[PDB]
Design a protein around this ligand. Sequence first.
Ligand SMILES: C[S@@+](CC[C@H](N)C(=O)[O-])C[C@H]1O[C@@H](n2cnc3c(N)ncnc32)[C@H](O)[C@@H]1O
Ligand SMILES: C[S@@+](CC[C@H](N)C(=O)[O-])C[C@H]1O[C@@H](n2cnc3c(N)ncnc32)[C@H](O)[C@@H]1O
Ligand SMILES: NC(=O)CC[C@H](N)C(=O)O
Ligand SMILES: NC(=O)CC[C@H](N)C(=O)O
Lengths: 274, 274
Amino acid sequence: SGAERKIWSLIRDCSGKLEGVTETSVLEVLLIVSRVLGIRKEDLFLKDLGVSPTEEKRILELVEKRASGYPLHYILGEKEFMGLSFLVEEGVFVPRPETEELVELALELIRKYGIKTVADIGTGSGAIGVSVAKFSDAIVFATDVSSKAVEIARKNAERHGVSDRFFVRKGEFLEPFKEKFASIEMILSNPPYVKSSAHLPKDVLFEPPEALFGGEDGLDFYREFFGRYDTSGKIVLMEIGEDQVEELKKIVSDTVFLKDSAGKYRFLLLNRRS
Amino acid sequence: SGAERKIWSLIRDCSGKLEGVTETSVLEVLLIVSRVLGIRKEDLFLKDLGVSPTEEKRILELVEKRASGYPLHYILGEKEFMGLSFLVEEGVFVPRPETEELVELALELIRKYGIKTVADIGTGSGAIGVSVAKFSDAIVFATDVSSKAVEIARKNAERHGVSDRFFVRKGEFLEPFKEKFASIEMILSNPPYVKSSAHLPKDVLFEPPEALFGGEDGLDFYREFFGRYDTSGKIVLMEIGEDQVEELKKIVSDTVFLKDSAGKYRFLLLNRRS
Ligand SMILES: C[S@@+](CC[C@H](N)C(=O)[O-])C[C@H]1O[C@@H](n2cnc3c(N)ncnc32)[C@H](O)[C@@H]1O
Ligand SMILES: C[S@@+](CC[C@H](N)C(=O)[O-])C[C@H]1O[C@@H](n2cnc3c(N)ncnc32)[C@H](O)[C@@H]1O
Ligand SMILES: NC(=O)CC[C@H](N)C(=O)O
Ligand SMILES: NC(=O)CC[C@H](N)C(=O)O
């Protein structure tokens, strides 16, 4: 099985070079390898699938890069979220698995109350907003303080054919959409909620810091948002940090807290849609 | 002396973490520090320069990032070239010192034969082209196969008030400007000339591979350029590898090869301006 070995021997060596950086070293290597050969994952099994000395060196270089902690998805240029391919790159936060659960709850709520207008603060790549626009009929108003996030969220909205229902503007909270505030029925968000003093793992070291830190508390976004806006008549669903429930209850009243599929508190839900 | 102890002790610890990654260890830390503090390098001495525990942590994180081999200029977001500050980021090649000497020779020939039209192939961040427009009267036609490079080159063009003399377009070689071909009196370029088999230093590992490699030989760009364009009545000045002179003589005849300030062969000059 001439070529069958070689590629799989290579796969294993690389996998070994990545452990200590990721528990899913084999998966990552498979992804890096198919990306460099220009084939879909599935074709990694094709008989007589070859790797030239150039493609081999490229793979070793990308593996050496990933070994430094650099994000796998920055290397891939994309991250799958809700089954959709979101373009990502340096300067943009990479969508996380827990945020998918926030979107599924948002969709269930949109179905339930026949909601038509949604907001996505801190849209980043557009993960939450674009997905909502993709699997519902709602229109979405998104914002981000990052110029780079706005341009990327636009591309991602266009990429999935929802540019007609997903609008993003640069700025903080909902300031760029003052004229639409009254009309917004649901406000979603996965804001920066990491404590200033929190230790950053090697890979998050490469993500935008403005996407992570929420002050000493890691609650600055919540305090300022709930302090400045009137949530009357609206529904607010936001992702939070495992240990912020008690402190959050003192920032916004009548709030409900739901947990992950991992059993950790992950979402705050305020329903003032009387 | 008290507040000076804080910052200067930090700078020393940081430098320690960067040895083995760079010989200009302390210079880099000085650049990184003045960036998170929002001041010029020249003000690092000042009176009482303090570092909040937040700025301290950010500095340590950026040093931890540089420690991985991540390019210093990607962290800084800029590179000084010809005394001008050029924006750079992932996806764009960081201007190199040597290329400054190519530009000086370019301004030499422009302010001699009184040249008015210049081309810059593979402009990257625009260092060569933009600098030429900024220090002379000639206009420049820049190109690059990198969409990312095109946008940055353009930004740097506006950033230096030369958007009216610097025109960049996506595509390879001079195709995107074919109709201006006869108009161009001088063709400048710092193309990819690294052998596809060459070892990549830790930080080069983070730059665009299309900006580095020129085939097994390292001379692909040259071979294709000279075998496609008639250089009659034009001056061609390009950067080359230090070990490519002899093989390059077999690709283009009647060419002169100039040396670095470091004694290495770095440029090829074909003057056919009759
Ligand atoms: C964790 S990231 C978002 C990632 C993306 N929403 C997701 O779910 O994958 C948080 C984003 O909030 C943005 N951000 C931070 N403060 C903000 C504010 N006050 N208003 C709007 N956006 C903000 C950042 O630029 C960052 O992209
Ligand atoms: C070594 S970098 C140039 C660095 C230099 N500091 C500058 O400002 O041009 C080479 C650039 O050439 C571009 N390039 C590579 N092949 C090319 C081609 N066939 N035609 C035009 N540009 C090309 C790349 O996208 C890359 O940005
Ligand atoms: N929302 C945030 O604070 C961004 C980071 C996110 N909690 C994560 O580590 O996946
Ligand atoms: N234009 C080039 O290929 C010069 C790049 C330079 N040899 C480097 O690797 O730093």
